[PDB]
């Protein structure tokens, strides 16, 4: 069947833009009908890696199951989460993507974190995350309590290291900083590992899925 995204882009839907949640749910579909110009997507500004590839790889899907890869209320004992940002508002209140978690310091510190997930499911798992690039050194210290930071993500088929680039960008949706979005398909039996000492927009919801109508 077809998957309808209403006023939303593939990015807004798959990241969980707060305005892209009333969507009629679907565990399978043959194509993605999306508007030539969706209004709701990356509510927090940034570059979305490999985006056309993701649209194509999600265009036809035989099984699609959301699951809490890193359970929000139980997986982050030493960090807090942002309560929300104005550019991602819902019902007149600051919010954020449903599928990511904006980790911030706790008790004036941001401890090193290391988090792994082994795909014991028997299908590919789509994992999505982001890296925050604050507009100035004062926001960097305010959230992450250190001037520089590292984010690392590694699987048997994905490996990349990220460094926040602190600089004032032109405002987009009122925001001078940026969040760049990344994703990978974790194969059955592989493990993905996240390591960071700051600037990680962590995965909260991931997706077990069967690409292909077959």
């Amino acid at each position, epitope marked *: 069947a077809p998957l309808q995204l209403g006023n939303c882009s593939v990015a807004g839907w798959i990241l969980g833009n707060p305005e892209c949640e009333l969507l009629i749910s679907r565990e399978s579909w043959s194509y993605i009908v999306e508007k030539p*110009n969706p209004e709701n997507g*990356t509510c927090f*500004p*940034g*570059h*979305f890696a490999d985006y056309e590839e993701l649209r194509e790889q999600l265009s036809s899907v035989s099984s699609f199951e959301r699951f809490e890869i890193f359970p929000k209320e139980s997986s982050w004992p030493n960090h807090e989460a942002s309560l929300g940002v104005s550019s991602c508002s819902h019902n007149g209140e600051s919010s954020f993507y449903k599928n990511l978690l904006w980790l911030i310091g706790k008790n004036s510190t941001y401890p090193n974190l290391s988090k792994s997930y082994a795909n014991n499911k028997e299908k590919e798992v789509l994992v999505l995350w982001g890296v925050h690039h604050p507009p100035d050194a004062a926001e960097q210290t305010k959230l992450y309590h250190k001037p520089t930071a590292y984010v690392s993500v590694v699987s048997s088929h994905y490996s990349r290291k990220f460094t926040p*680039r602190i*600089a*004032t*960008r*032109s*405002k*987009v*949706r*009122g925001q*001078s900083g*940026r969040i*760049n979005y990344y994703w990978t398909l974790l194969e059955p039996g592989d493990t993905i590992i996240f390591e960071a000492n700051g600037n990680l927009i962590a995965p909260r919801y991931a997706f077990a899925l069967s690409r292909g109508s077959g």
Partner: antibody
Amino acid sequence: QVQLEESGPGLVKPSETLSLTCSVSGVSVTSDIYYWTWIRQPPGKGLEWIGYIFYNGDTNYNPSLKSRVTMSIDTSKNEFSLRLTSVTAADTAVYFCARGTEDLGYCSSGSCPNHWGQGTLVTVSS
Amino acid sequence: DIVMTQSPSSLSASIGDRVTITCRPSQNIRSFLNWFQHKPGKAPKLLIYAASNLQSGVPSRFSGSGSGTEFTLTIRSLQPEDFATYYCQQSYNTPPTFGQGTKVEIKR
């Protein structure tokens, strides 16, 4: 914050070389995210892009200017510059320097100068 | 090469009036279009970024809209300080290009 200020020869003779210097204050030209730009406004006309340069040495220049265009960056003085050769009266203009910030989600590389200087007039005649 | 065509080239409007300046590029450019304000002898200022985004220090009367092959800068309650020449700029193809400009003057 960031201050950019252009300096140069107000008068240049034809067939000679135009040299122009942007003094940047508040930020380091050594950045890997910020890019540097020259733009010009011929008398009576609009805005013409000259080109960009990144500290990584990556540069791109307007095809219209053929190959008379050079930019460089002086880490020692925190400045960038422009050199234009075989100058004609058609190069008479106010010259603008500007900073931008790499932002591939909303701009092609080095293509969105967003903090400009006030400009400096360069007249080409004998 | 991407040719940027603005309309009108000049206009006169009363204080409090809503002004609309239009920009059409020679090809689709998505939202890779910015708007600048330029006053004689002053530094150009980026007012709108990526078609619709207000910049810091820019009053809420300024708005940008459109995508692809049609863009509009709107100034809703023209004020005397808005006297200037406005330019659209495409950031989609390597040679960045500007529209010819739209001069805004005050009707009295």
